[PDB]
Design a protein around this ligand. Structure first.
Ligand SMILES: O=C(Cc1ccccc1)Nc1nnc(N[C@H]2CCN(c3nnc(NC(=O)Cc4ccccc4)s3)C2)s1
Ligand SMILES: O=C(Cc1ccccc1)Nc1nnc(N[C@H]2CCN(c3nnc(NC(=O)Cc4ccccc4)s3)C2)s1
Lengths: 410, 410, 410, 410
């Protein structure tokens, strides 16, 4: 009694076969998108079948088996409701309420220190969800590219710890928040930057990646790495933001020369080239949709959820989530850690890279920032989310009062 | 087919009578103690039955049913391996190796500013486990009484947030760590102590509990909460420690008056009386085993694991856990959050109150402190614990490299 | 060839028989007062001759000599214009213009944290001058008693360096200003208060004075010493201030307990007793006129200018003046040192103890303090004084542009 | 009678003619140099007279008049012993004692971050005196050129206050010492550097001087300014140290970008070019003797003591001396102010620019620095000088215990 046939009848309702649209609809309702890389063969076999019989197609059991056999295990988990969020249709309904609610918060100031950022309209607002099992949901402007800015800091920290290990990386950068009044100091008592989530630390981290090769190859290697983290969804580069960040960033040059003088770089660092590498990394483009997959790689222990590929070592993933917890929303980090309890990372383009470990990854994006540098809609969304679901890090998974737990049906 | 029935067949394993000791040995091997408050009716019936039938010692199906009918639900989960840690026998093997490995860590200095903590032998070393289901295990000197000291700061903060709620409590005290040299500034920029886990924060929080009645009743009020949290195991009091804490507490007096000058207490606070209360709360005694139940209650979203009693609101538990994470280990807080990633609190007696949310609570006691005030052996144990098991708060439950997950078997 | 009437003709004006009023008036015109202790005998001989005769009286070349012979050398410099300010009468004319100019300044708030300090009227305003030669001038409420408060800090520090020397004293207290927003810290990086002019330093200084003996005898000794410093003009004690300063002294008890815990006191100190002694010293009363003598003892290298008695070692006077320069006006100290350039010390009763080295001492008193604790009228008077005369510590004695030099005559 | 003649009678001492050498020796012993600018006429006539009348050579009274007539006033004060240090031959013997004492202090380390200062032998040790009246004395290596380094910081600040006034300049820089081990902060809380005497402060002052012209002209305008201050003694320039200072100046570029980002420079500043000007001003060369004249101009209210020329406004001179008092010896400033009480500035090349207000200026030079950056020999010298002489700024001029007063005689 084989899986492909049990599934066939589970979808077959006792009618002797299954219309293709009716398989596509049942698939989409599990959260999986028909373009999921892990479903390629199934979809290739489907489109081959719709070249044959162009009147239908209506699939019997061996023809259904013919398409679905290569992806049956992933399909059985989808259809039997084994994903981390079983009733994904209900849950994306709540995401949308949360989306509409936060959309009413028009406050904040679009970052304008740079013309590329000032140009973005304050009304742009998108939330994208990718769960640990590949369930996708978007609402809003989830396909408009924008710059990762400081959202790239946890990613490139991840890469560095991935390639070099925790111990090496933290020879050069701390692992604690500075305290709501060393905001302004570049270095802790040990003469290292306080953590990889602030600019001095991000800049040092940058000097660690793929040492020995030139900047063009370093950027290629980070790009190929982001490509894997996003399951080959959109990752681009904004040369306008780049040129302009590097002509309008005296603060970072001040940090660079400070780091150089205190001997904060590995031996042989070319500090002015590192800053230029840094500015490019800040100008990498993503969409809400592709950036949520990247977070979901981090929610999923370093496996990209829509491709199954191992992208980052668990160590790198745990360090990254750890520092995003305490250091990820700038001056709001401790408040965010207390009330939201989620690892998150914000950037000046208006994005919050949000990770719900073991559940989902998310990317919120609205250009208007509050006075601490965080997207107003983004922040408002993060508070709502944790007020709704027991996703706060220290919510209890058994006794969670009247909050909703999307991981369950009852 | 009733459940006391199905389970009777589960234990009988072929025979039609079950020897009593066979049911007891099966019970103990689930981690449950035979003294479990949730098992009293069943254990009273087994005692009575052995009195009225020394012509055994074997339990019919009808007889086994008269004994377990009371506690059948729990006994079901214990026996159908439904507890948070199913193979508890193997897990305690690991706790014992962890215990032995930390035991060989002879360094440190016993706190001798009081002649009551100075008396304790450096060789005392105890580790007690109580899971979210009541599963108990202890190794080492887990029945020696010692003073909580600063391990009581999360407990009384939890009581404050329980009775008064998050917004009121944090009018008087912050929710962030300070910075690894703001250890000496009693106040943050809003003239609030930084968090409840430092002395000025504990002192201010002590002043929010049971306002308006004397220290006799305030104390009894807190003790009664500490009894419910520990499932009514040992919660004592060391008047010897308390007299010396108050004869030798220049700094807290420095803090108390400084707090009074800055208007940090609620209106009509008798600060010098609040310091005396505070010194009393520090002198409360526990054992590794009784305190492990307190940790387990915070592990369990505020329900005591061996009684089923709701002791704390989720809100209280979530805040307490949030702040033990980032502030609970003094100047080691940030490194502890990074490498161990578990809510913990330490005290100058040598305790570390340890919480694995949704899994278990623990208490580790060894008096010799490292130069940052934390028990050497406790600290070494906590690192090994999370090297071995995917209990780091930002470990992943599905992809955890070479770590072991005791929540599943095979 | 006698000095005694190379002078009576200096006074005689060709006429050969000097009236008394005309000798007193010429005396007063030099700045000396008819009650100068150095002039007692000459005034004793005048009191006797004024009863030998009611018909006059007046003097000739031998009963003049009869009265003045005892104090001739001091009289000769007085009448030959050899004092530090020759044309004293035009100088008091400027002090009066400075006085009245500052009286128009109604800003400020009278310290009211003490009902004694809130008792005093905002309209009180007095400036008192005593030069290094005993020349006196007053204008305004220069006889109203008021507490020294922090004005006593340089005095008791002087006494302390006097009795124990520079090296011993600075084992316990620093000799620099802190940094204009590390006022809040009680201890520098060596665990000493920053300087004797802040409350932590003053409190440590208080613990050095007359160690071994008790508070009643210690207060008598400071009083004897203040009495010498002030040429036995008015010094007293306000108990109302004392009792109110010791009820409302939470900050000082914070310093006391902080100091004791960091082991900041000489071995054997009774901290709580030192604070009461400290509170007494702040309650010591003076007048403008009497305090200006105390300042003039410091202007004059430690000799009281109206008795000639050597009250303080030079060491003590230099150290005191050094630190009143940099630390004596609280958070205004560095501005004050920059613009006024005079060793000065303020207190919350409204007093500015002002010293012009090698020239004069003063006491300004007006109770309305500014936002930084300094008497408004006082500060304003001090700026005017240095705008007008080249008394700025880094004015040039030879080239000084538009400024007047009262020490000269062209 | 005439003053040339009266003075001729005093040097002739009975005979009818004064040998020329008898008059030169009389003049030199006053401390004046035979090359004094204010003496060129008299000295030109003396050389011309030894040509036109080789017959001797002895100056009758008519011939002595023809030589000293144009310089009679200065020669009078020189010979009626009316200079600020009357017995200059006795005081120089003391400077020589102070010199040789401090010579035996071979400790400290020569600045080596730049090759051209690692050049200098650790045994070079020169002390030069120039009084407020032109009396000169040198001992040691007083004609070796060295770089002003930070000794230029009071000079250019003076130039800036001279041309711009106190109020404008101190919109851009403060006037207080920072706080010891608060040397790291480039900015105080008004986002101004702390004082002109630290690098951030100096760099901002550099950008106020002569806004609107290129570095060629800014530099020349400062140089001609230093020249007048040195009475046209040697004021050089080490293009070697400038090129090197600019290659290895990471901290300064760090300061530069930091200040530009904080909007610390006058509008329209070319910060990179301001840094190059700054590195130039640091490379200006002097000698002990020439810089001793620059300090003497600061000793003398801004008049160059050997030319009579007004160089700096008294305001400029008083601010500079105020800030050298509190901020001029790096982290030793507060200790230096306390024990030396003399306006001084130090530099990495080994120089201490020292000012005894109203008396003399000095340059001590020895390349080995102590750990705080201050010349070990210079520091040792300054302490000896003030232990010997009542030159401490808060020494008393009339009561100075056993200290010696070189302003006095018998
Ligand atoms: O330990 C050293 C040596 C040392 C070492 C290294 C450098 C300097 C000094 N010195 C000292 N540490 N602590 C001292 N005094 C205790 C009594 C009063 N205390 C205060 N608590 N909070 C304060 N500030 C605010 O509430 C406001 C604020 C918040 C954030 C930023 C700015 C202002 S004052 C602590 S003395
Ligand atoms: O912050 C204000 C005043 C201000 C301005 C406005 C409002 C309030 C206060 N001014 C300024 N902030 N930042 C400035 N410049 C940056 C250049 C690199 N700087 C560093 N200095 N020190 C660092 N770390 C250590 O030394 C290690 C350590 C930490 C703790 C204890 C002991 C040692 S990094 C900061 S200048």
């Amino acid at each position: 009694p084989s899986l492909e046939d049990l599934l066939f009848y589970t979808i077959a309702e006792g009618q002797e076969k299954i219309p293709v649209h009716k398989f596509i609809t049942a698939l989409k309702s599990t959260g999986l998108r028909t373009s999921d890389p892990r479903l390629k063969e199934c979809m290739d076999m489907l489109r081959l079948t719709l070249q044959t019989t162009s009147d239908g197609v209506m699939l019997d059991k061996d023809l259904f088996k013919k398409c679905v056999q290569s992806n049956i295990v992933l399909l059985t988990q989808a259809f039997r409701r084994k994903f981390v969020i079983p009733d994904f249709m209900s849950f994306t309904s709540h995401i949308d309420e949360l989306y509409e609610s936060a959309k009413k918060q028009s406050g904040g100031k679009v970052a304008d220190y740079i013309p590329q950022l000032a140009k973005f309209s304050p009304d742009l607002w998108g939330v994208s969800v990718c769960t640990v099992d590949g369930q996708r949901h978007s609402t809003g402007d989830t396909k408009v590219p924008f710059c990762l800015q400081s959202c790239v800091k946890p990613l490139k920290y991840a890469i560095a710890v991935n390639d070099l290990g925790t111990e090496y990386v933290h020879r050069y950068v701390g692992k604690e928040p500075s305290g709501l009044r060393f905001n302004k100091l570049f270095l802790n008592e040990d003469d290292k930057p306080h953590n990889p989530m602030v600019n001095a630390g991000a800049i040092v981290v940058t000097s660690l990646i793929k040492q020995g090769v030139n900047n063009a190859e370093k950027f290629d290697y980070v790009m190929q790495f982001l490509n894997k983290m996003a399951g080959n969804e959109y990752v681009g580069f904004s040369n306008a933001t780049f040129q302009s960040e590097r002509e309008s960033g005296d603060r970072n040059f001040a940090i660079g020369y400070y780091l150089k003088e205190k001997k904060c770089f590995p031996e042989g660092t070319d500090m002015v080239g590192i800053l230029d590498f840094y500015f490019q990394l800040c100008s990498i483009e993503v969409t809400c949709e592709s950036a949520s997959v990247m977070a979901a790689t981090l929610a999923n222990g370093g496996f990209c959820p829509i491709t199954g590929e191992r992208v980052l070592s668990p160590e790198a993933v745990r360090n990254t989530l750890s520092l995003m917890h305490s250091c990820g929303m700038y001056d709001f980090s401790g408040q965010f850690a207390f009330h939201v309890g989620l690892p998150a990372k914000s950037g000046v383009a208006g994005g919050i890279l949000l990770v719900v470990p073991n559940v989902m990854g998310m990317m919120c994006w609205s250009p208007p920032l509050d006075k601490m540098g965080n997207s107003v809609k983004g922040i408002h969304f993060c508070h709502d989310l944790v007020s709704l679901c027991n996703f706060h890090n220290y919510d209890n998974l058994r006794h969670f009062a009247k909050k909703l737990d999307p991981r369950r049906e009852g």
